[PDB]
Amino acid sequence: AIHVGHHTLVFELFGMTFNGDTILATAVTAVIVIALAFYLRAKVTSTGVPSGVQLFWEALTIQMRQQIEGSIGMKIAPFVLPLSVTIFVFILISNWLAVLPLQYGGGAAAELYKAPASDINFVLALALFVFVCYHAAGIWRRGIVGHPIKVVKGHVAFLAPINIVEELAKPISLALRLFGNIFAGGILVALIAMFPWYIQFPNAVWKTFDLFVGLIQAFIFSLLTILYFSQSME
Amino acid sequence: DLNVEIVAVERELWSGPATFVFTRTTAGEIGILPRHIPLVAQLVDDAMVRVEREGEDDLRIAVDGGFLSVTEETVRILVENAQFESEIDADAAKEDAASDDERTAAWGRARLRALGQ
Amino acid sequence: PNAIITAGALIGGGLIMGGGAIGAGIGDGIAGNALISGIARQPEAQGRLFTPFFITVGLVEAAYFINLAFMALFVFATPGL
Amino acid sequence: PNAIITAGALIGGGLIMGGGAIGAGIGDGIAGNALISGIARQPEAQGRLFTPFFITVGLVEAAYFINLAFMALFVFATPGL
Amino acid sequence: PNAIITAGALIGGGLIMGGGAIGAGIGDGIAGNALISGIARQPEAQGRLFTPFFITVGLVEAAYFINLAFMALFVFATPGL
Amino acid sequence: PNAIITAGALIGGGLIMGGGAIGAGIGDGIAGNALISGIARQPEAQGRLFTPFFITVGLVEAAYFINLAFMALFVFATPGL
Amino acid sequence: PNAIITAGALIGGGLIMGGGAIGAGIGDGIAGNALISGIARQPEAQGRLFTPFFITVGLVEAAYFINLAFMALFVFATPGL
Amino acid sequence: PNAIITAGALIGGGLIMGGGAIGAGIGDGIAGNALISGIARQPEAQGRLFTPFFITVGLVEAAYFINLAFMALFVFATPGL
Amino acid sequence: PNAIITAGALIGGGLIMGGGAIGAGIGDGIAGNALISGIARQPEAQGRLFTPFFITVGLVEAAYFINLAFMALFVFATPGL
Amino acid sequence: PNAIITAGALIGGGLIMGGGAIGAGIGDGIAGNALISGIARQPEAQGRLFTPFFITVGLVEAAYFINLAFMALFVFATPGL
Amino acid sequence: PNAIITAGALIGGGLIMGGGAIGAGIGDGIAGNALISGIARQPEAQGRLFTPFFITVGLVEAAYFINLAFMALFVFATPGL
Amino acid sequence: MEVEYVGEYSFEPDPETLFDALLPRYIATRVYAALLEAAASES
Amino acid sequence: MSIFIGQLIGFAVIAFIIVKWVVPPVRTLMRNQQEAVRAALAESAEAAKK
Amino acid sequence: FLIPNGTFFAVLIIFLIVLGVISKWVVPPISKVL
Ligand SMILES: O=c1c(NCc2ccccn2)c(-c2ccc(N3CCOCC3)cc2)c1=O
């Protein structure tokens, strides 16, 4: 049978419970991202032919700057560029790492590395950080008094009740879209684990979707973050 | 009934009454019977036109970059240059349809469509 | 008593996902229809249409995946059990 | 007694959320179709089309949210339970 | 007896709200599609267009809100209880 | 006996009213799409498109309201018992 | 026995009416969309377009009204009692 | 037992007619949208447009009427009774 | 036991043919809308368009009739039972 | 016990084939609408349009046939007995 | 108890796949409509239109397969059993 | 070209692209009319 | 083990797919981009020299 | 499953650390290169 939750390495500290497996997966993806960043630093050059990681970073930064400038120029929001990029890779590397052959049989199926996005804590951390950050940006640009006023007013004043709710919806959905996309997958690949090995082709088909959908979800998450910044920064 | 005025910048080509007029606009094929809604459209660079009227045969026109206007009584077809079926030369059109120049190739293909295929 | 509630929760979650999948599939198909039509009309649109497109998908998927979240509550954490 | 009421409430909430998701996904996809088509026709429209768009999206998702609220009133709270 | 009637009322209200939300979301998306397309094609007609838009939405939402009115009556008044 | 009949009547009335809501909302949205687009293309047609519009809406609303009546006949009155 | 058949008949008649209403509303909206678009394009086309329109509606509403009669058969004089 | 079988047959026939009515109404509306649009665009082509129309209708209505036939089998014959 | 299985088979077949009817009617209506729009555009093309139109109608009717055969399997040769 | 499971499996299979038929019919009709339209505008495009068509149909029909297989599961190899 | 839960899980999975099939089929058809229309308008655009198409498909099919997952969860790994 | 307002229709595929394709044609037609007027005047 | 073997074979299949159909295009793009960077560097070079 | 716990912070800090490394040693160098 399938299980939901059942996190491993769970511990308790400071009066709070922590999912050890989720933290370990987040740390693994974070250290991979940091290794990529430091390899760029060690091998970044403008006077010579770029490295592979340099090309990847240039492409991602150019894309994110293109989305930012098309909605909110970096003269107003230069800080959302280092954000939108990391949110991408942090999510992307988080999802694609689940494509490694790290699934085995306990007889219940288990995985050494389970995608952090499959945990509500990871997605909520990312989504609420984005929420707080772009609300702070909106407060800065419109003022602590004017920002709530323009948030409630929105584009149409008399639609105020439909505005506030949407503002509270942005984070939740921004999280739930990421979690549901990956959590669901965590069940599919577990269900595929019930097949015998010679029937268990379905992993190849789903894994490719997981690559595709993880890339799409990283892109959508980052781009919706940029859009939220564009909206909250006038 | 319809009256079709196929007019060229140089001169007019035909203005007699017609029952049905058919041609390839840039949006696709189109046919017109009387009382059609007023319209403005651009013909494809290789557009061919066919007009059907009482008794007489089908009048086929090789049209170069024309424009079709539909009015509450008239249907006018402006053409940079248009040639009737009775005037076209098969060998010359065949040779020109393969020309490298886009305009020349389109004109040749229009002339072939005026004959067939 | 728990069996009845479990069957009801399964049916409810099935309805949740049926609606979510209908909405997601149809909305994503419509958004992709717009994307494909725009790219066919003006090829370079490739560059600029993935921003509004993935926003639309982002809106279409939300209503789906939120439902999916509320499915997990229905199926794995049945509120009224 | 309460088992039947809870099962009925779960089924009703599933219906609410399925209908809400269908409406939201399909309406958002339809609105994003117009948004994508307009941006394809005119890239500058990128700027001005989000105001009509996000009005639509919001009105379309109102029905989703109100429904969602009442689903929270169905499964967590339960009239007649 | 009251348990069965309450479960039926919950299911009926869920059907009402699911259908109402489907109609509301899809109709609002369709109307906003016309609004967005018109504003893209004719930018100066924005104010000119919000009148026929909010009218149509006002109709669509009306259909929704009537249904909501009834759903409360189903779940809180529950005729025949 | 009256409990089962009343539960069935509530479910049937919910189906009637939800289907009427879907039809009314989607038809009103579709008609409003034409209204908004025509007004976008023709400022003057504003006056003359209200006649074809309210006729269409009149039909779309009619099927809705009839359902409402029957829904009442299902829930307030009960044809069976 | 009669109570179960009555509840089933009420549910079936509700399904009939919901389907008939969805079809009627959406078809009438789709036909009125063409009517409004044609009358916006050509304003003098009104008298010409009411014949194709009322035919379509005549078909659409026909499918609706048939569902009424059978609904009555389901609801009043329930078969198989 | 027939009570249960008869109730199930009534629900099944109601589903059959609901689906048939949805399909008939929506397909007839869609076909009449094309008929009205063509007769608006080409007033003189009505005769050439009604033959494709009544063909299309003749298809969708068939799907309706076939369903109706089977409804009777469910409602009056009740094969499993 | 059979009465329950028979009622379930009847409801399943009702869903089977309801979905078949919805799909058949709407798909045939859309294909006929395309056919009628094409013939209004180019009234001499009636002969050419019947091949794609009949291919589409054949696909839709193949789906519909495979579903009607599976309803027949459900009702007259109920699996299990 | 087995009777209830079989009835539920039959209802599930009826829902699956019904949704599958809706999807197949509507998607095939939508794709054939584009096929017929494109062949109407471009008579010679047939050759190049049957490849994108049978691709998209190939997807849509796939969604159908998958369901069919699983429905056989539900009804012949019904899990959970 | 397990019989009721199994029947509910089967009905829920049937709803899940019905919705998934509807969404996948209709979205694939809608995307294929754009693909066919664009390849008709721009025959040389086919290679460029597959990327927007297979992305769109890749979305809707995903929504399908996710449903296929949670059906297998309901049917083969019934939660709450 | 200046725009002059006079005082107190369907399009395929859209009126803006048609306008773009027709303005060069209008300029060509006016140049042609000028050339014919010049030829008659020269004669 | 059976689960591990099955998922490993699936991973191998997807790896082969990406290496034979996804790696080639991406690789090109990387090389074409590098071409560009080196080229621009050298062109600045020649413009300054010239 | 949907109830958060301390991991919400544990992830957040890590993300911030990444948001630091990228915001200092990635984005500024890449912007300079471009
Ligand atoms: O994602 C995003 C999403 N909605 C997805 C969703 C969440 C819950 C339920 C259903 N759908 C939105 C969104 C953002 C703003 C907005 N408006 C602002 C202007 O004034 C009207 C409201 C409307 C929508 C996403 O960005």
Structure tokens at D35: 């948004």
- Does residue G81 sit within a domain? no
Q: Are the C-beta atoms of I40 and H41 separated by less than 8 Å?
A: yes
Q: Do residue A166 and residue D61 have CB atoms under 8 angstroms apart?
A: yes
Judge if the beta carbon of residue A169 lies within 6 A of ligand 1: yes
Using DSSP's 3-state secondary structure scheme, residue B66 falls into coil
Whether chain L has a CB inside 8 Å of the CB on B55: the answer is no
Q: How far apart are CA A114 and CA A92, in angstroms?
A: 14
Q: Do residue B36 and residue H41 have CB atoms under 8 angstroms apart?
A: yes
Judge if the beta carbon of residue A51 lies within 6 A of ligand 1: no
Residue of C nearest to D40 (CA): C38
- CB contacts of I41 in chain B (<8 Å) are 28-31
Q: Is the dihedral of CA E72, E75, E76, E78 positive or negative?
A: positive
- CATH for D14: 1.20.20.10
Whether chain E has a CB inside 8 Å of the CB on D56: the answer is yes
Number of DSSP helices (H) and strands (E) in chain B, helices first = 2, 11
Using DSSP's 3-state secondary structure scheme, residue F7 falls into helix
Q: Do residue B36 and residue H44 have CB atoms under 8 angstroms apart?
A: yes
- CATH for B57: 2.60.15.10
Structure tokens at G55: 């035919």
Q: Is the dihedral of CA E62, E68, E72, E74 positive or negative?
A: positive
- Does residue K51 sit within a domain? yes
Q: Are the C-beta atoms of H30 and J33 separated by less than 8 Å?
A: no
Q: How far apart are CA A70 and CA N34, in angstroms?
A: 18
Q: How far is the CA of C25 from the centre of ligand 1 (A)?
A: 19
Q: How far is the CA of A163 from the centre of ligand 1 (A)?
A: 9
User: How many structural domains does chain H have?
Assistant: 1
Structure tokens at K36: 């066919």
Q: Is the dihedral of CA A186, A188, A194, A198 positive or negative?
A: negative
Q: Are the C-beta atoms of A76 and N9 separated by less than 8 Å?
A: no
- CB contacts of B32 in chain H (<8 Å) are 42
| Best D56, D76, D78 residue to mutate vs chain E (most E CBs within 10 Å) | D56
Could you say which DSSP state residue A48 is in?
S
DSSP string, C14-25: HHHHHHHHHHHH
Using DSSP's 3-state secondary structure scheme, residue G27 falls into helix
Reported residue count of chain D is 81
Give the residue, out of C59, C60, C64, C68, with the most ligand 1 atoms within 8 A of its beta carbon, to mutate for a pocket test: C59
Q: How far apart are CA H7 and CA H13, in angstroms?
A: 10
Q: Are the C-beta atoms of I16 and I71 separated by less than 8 Å?
A: yes
Could you say which DSSP state residue E77 is in?
I
Identity of the residue in M30, M33, M41 whose CB atom sits nearest the CB atom of A47: M41
Resolution (A): 2.8
Neighbouring chains of D at 3+ CB pairs under 8 Å are: A, C, E
Q: How far apart are CA D33 and CA C57, in angstroms?
A: 10
Residue of H nearest to G43 (CA): H40
Q: Which helix (H) or strand (E) holds B8?
A: strand B2-8
Q: Is the dihedral of CA J20, J24, J25, J30 positive or negative?
A: positive
**Sequence letter at residue J47:** G
- Does residue J81 sit within a domain? no
| Best H41, H46, H48, H50 residue to mutate vs chain B (most B CBs within 10 Å) | H41
Q: Are the C-beta atoms of B65 and B45 separated by less than 8 Å?
A: yes
Side-chain half-sphere exposure of I39, counting CA atoms within 13 A: 29
- Does residue I24 sit within a domain? yes
Identity of the residue in A173, A179, A220 whose CB atom sits nearest the CB atom of C57: A220
- Does residue E81 sit within a domain? no
* Residue whose token pair is 């009905």: K11
The residues with which B78 forms a beta bridge, in sequence order, are B7, B67
The residues with which B39 forms a beta bridge, in sequence order, are B70, L10
**What's the distance, CA G52 to chain centroid?**
18
Could you say which DSSP state residue H62 is in?
H
Judge if the beta carbon of residue C55 lies within 6 A of ligand 1: no
Q: How, if at all, do strands B28-32 and B20-25 pair?
A: antiparallel
Residue B14: which domain range?
A: 2-115
Structure tokens at C68: 């999916």
Residue of F nearest to E13 (CA): F14
**What separation in angstroms does the CA of G39 have from each of B73, E1, F48, G49?**
19, 56, 8, 8
Residue of H nearest to G58 (CA): H28
Task: Give which of A114, G78, K55, A51 is closest to C46, Cα–Cα.
Answer: K55
3-state percent helix, strand, coil for chain N, nearest multiple of 5: 75, 0, 25
Structure tokens at K12: 């829920």
Per the entry, the structure determination technique was: cryo-EM
Task: Give which of B49, F52, C62, L34 is closest to A172, Cα–Cα.
Answer: C62
DSSP string, A178-203: HHHHHHHHHHHHHHHTTS-TTT--HH
Could you say which DSSP state residue H75 is in?
I
Per-window interface: D 2-41 vs C, CB < 8 A? 2-4, 6-15, 17-37, 39-41
Whether chain A has a CB inside 8 Å of the CB on K81: the answer is yes
Structure tokens at E3: 């348990």
Q: Do residue J40 and residue B27 have CB atoms under 8 angstroms apart?
A: no
Judge if the beta carbon of residue C59 lies within 6 A of ligand 1: yes
Q: Are the C-beta atoms of B60 and B34 separated by less than 8 Å?
A: no
Inspect the structure and tell me whether chains B and N have 3 or more CB pairs less than 8 Å apart: no
Identity of the residue in M4, M11, M13 whose CB atom sits nearest the CB atom of A100: M11
Q: How far is the CA of A175 from the centre of ligand 1 (A)?
A: 13
Structure tokens at K74: 């309901």
- Does residue K81 sit within a domain? no
Ligand 1 atom index nearest CA of D24: 10
3-state percent helix, strand, coil for chain F, nearest multiple of 5: 90, 0, 10
Residue of J nearest to B26 (CA): J41
Q: How, if at all, do strands B2-8 and A109-111 pair?
A: unpaired
- Does residue E47 sit within a domain? yes
- Does residue C29 sit within a domain? yes
Residue H11: which domain range?
A: 1-76
